[PDB]
Amino acid sequence: LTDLPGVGPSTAEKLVEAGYIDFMKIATATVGELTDIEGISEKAAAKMIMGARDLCDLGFKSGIDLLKQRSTVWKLSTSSSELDSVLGGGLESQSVTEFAGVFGSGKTQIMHQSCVNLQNPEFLFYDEEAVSKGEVAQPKAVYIDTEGTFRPERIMQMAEHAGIDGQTVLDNTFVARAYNSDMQMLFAEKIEDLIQEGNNIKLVVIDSLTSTFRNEYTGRGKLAERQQKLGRHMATLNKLADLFNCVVLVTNQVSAKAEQAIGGHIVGHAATFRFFVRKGKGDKRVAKLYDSPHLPDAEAIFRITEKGIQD
Ligand SMILES: Nc1ncnc2c1ncn2[C@@H]1O[C@H](COP(=O)(O)OP(=O)(O)NP(=O)(O)O)[C@@H](O)[C@H]1O
Ligand SMILES: [Ca+2]
Ligand SMILES: [Ca+2]
Ligand SMILES: [Ca+2]
Ligand SMILES: [Mg+2]
Ligand code: NA
């Protein structure tokens, strides 16, 4: 931190105590939030922000540099060949991927499978030239369980069939049971603390994204209140994905009129990739990608078995 203009040993202390230990967090901060820190004046705040941006080289980029930025995105395999294909390789870091669908479609299964897959080095696809082995080493997951359906048994079973050690997945997966939207949002905001404590959080799961909000703000005469809170939550998730180069996955429920993911416009805008998971015959499932910034809408057929997600 003292590498930053105006920042001395004392100011560096104030910053770390305030939660600002990374150059990127400072470069992307507002004069206000920094001035909210005791002895940090407006000029000092503005000076260190500009300095952090410079050190992080956050200016105009063009040509090959645009490809290099895109190469810092790594992807997590879903264990499904067709789904990985529709995803353009796998679940993308630096983005929010939403899986919506009717009950029993497999949303929670995909979340569990992702926590397991994170522990298989060969399931993280990346360009070694842009992403070092160290950046994805000792990856850990955060599972914000809003519906109380996290199941250690399922983790162990999926791990076993993948040839991975179940206990290792549990040891490297943080689960936070949220009973309402306030806890849900706070847990998400506190993931930064886990990072600061030395945990390489590379996967963040929110299951479910909207169930709490939908139950707390029912009156359609309070919908604005809900969309605002939902918007702040989504903003935290997106920034989280970018600053810590991790994949963020969220599940969403559906309502009639055929079906549409709930959460309104804000969720639609904030989500990067949007899927509708449908049920086929027996254990067959169809993941339909209907929105993304660079991939064509497409369908991926897969199955949910005792082994987890397969095909
Ligand atoms: N141990 C298992 N072995 C085989 N199939 C399983 C196992 N556990 C769950 N399933 C399948 O997973 C389906 C449920 O997946 P799940 O991801 O929980 O649905 P969901 O979309 O999240 N539904 P909901 O929480 O109501 O929105 C079941 O109905 C089972 O067919
Ligand atoms: Ca992003
Ligand atoms: Ca259910
Ligand atoms: Ca079933
Ligand atoms: Mg579920
Ligand atoms: Na096994």
Closest residue by Cα to atom 2, ligand 1, is 306
Same domain, 52 and 148: no
Same domain, 13 and 157: no
Q: In a mutational test of the pocket of ligand 1, which residue from 99, 102, 107 has the highest number of ligand atoms less than 8 Å from its CB?
A: 107
Domain containing 187 — which CATH number?
3.40.50.300
Cβ atoms within 10 Å, residue 301 = 15
Same domain, 144 and 44: no
Coil/strand/helix, residue 286: strand
Closest residue by Cα to atom 11, ligand 1, is 304
Find out whether the beta carbon of 105 lies less than 6 Å from any atom of ligand 1: yes
Domain region containing 247: 63-311
Same domain, 43 and 116: no
- Domain boundary, last residue among 33, 62, 91: 62
- Domain boundary, last residue among 17, 40, 62: 62
Distance (angstroms) between ligand 1 centre and the Cα of 222 equals: 33
Same domain, 57 and 81: no
Q: What are phi and psi of 310, to 5 degrees?
A: -150, 165
Domain containing 24 — which CATH number?
1.10.150.20
Find out whether the beta carbon of 109 lies less than 6 Å from any atom of ligand 1: yes
Q: Is the peptide bond before 105 cis (omega within 30 degrees of 0)?
A: no
DSSP 112: H
Same domain, 73 and 189: yes
Same domain, 8 and 144: no
Same domain, 15 and 134: no
Rounded to an integer, what distance in angstroms lies between the CA atom of residue 294 and that of residue 68? 17
Buried b / exposed e across 92-114, counting CB within 10 Å, b at 16+?
bbbbbbbbbbeeebbbbbbbbbb
Closest residue by Cα to atom 27, ligand 1, is 103
Distance (angstroms) between ligand 4 centre and the Cα of 106 equals: 9
Is 104 annotated as contributing to ligand binding? yes
Number of domains in the chain: 2
Residue ranges of alpha helices (H) inside the chain are 9-18, 23-27, 31-35, 42-55, 64-70, 81-86, 107-117, 152-162, 166-171, 181-189, 191-196, 211-216, 223-243, 264-270
Neighbours of ion ligand 3 (CB under 5 A): 103
Same domain, 15 and 122: no
Cβ atoms within 10 Å, residue 235 = 12
Q: Which residues contact 214 (CB under 8 A, 6 or more apart)?
A: 226, 253, 262, 263
- Domain boundary, last residue among 13, 42, 62: 62
Same domain, 37 and 99: no
Rounded to an integer, what distance in angstroms lies between the CA atom of residue 261 and that of residue 274? 9
Same domain, 68 and 160: yes
Rounded to an integer, what distance in angstroms lies between the CA atom of residue 55 and that of residue 48? 10
Rounded to an integer, what distance in angstroms lies between the CA atom of residue 81 and that of residue 282? 19
Helices (H) and strands (E) in the chain, counts: 14, 14
**Residue 223 · residue 5 · CB < 8 Å:** no
Resolution of this deposited model, Å: 1.9
Same domain, 187 and 91: yes
Distance (angstroms) between ligand 6 centre and the Cα of 156 equals: 10
Buried b / exposed e across 203-223, counting CB within 10 Å, b at 16+?
bbbbbbbbbbbbeebeeeeee
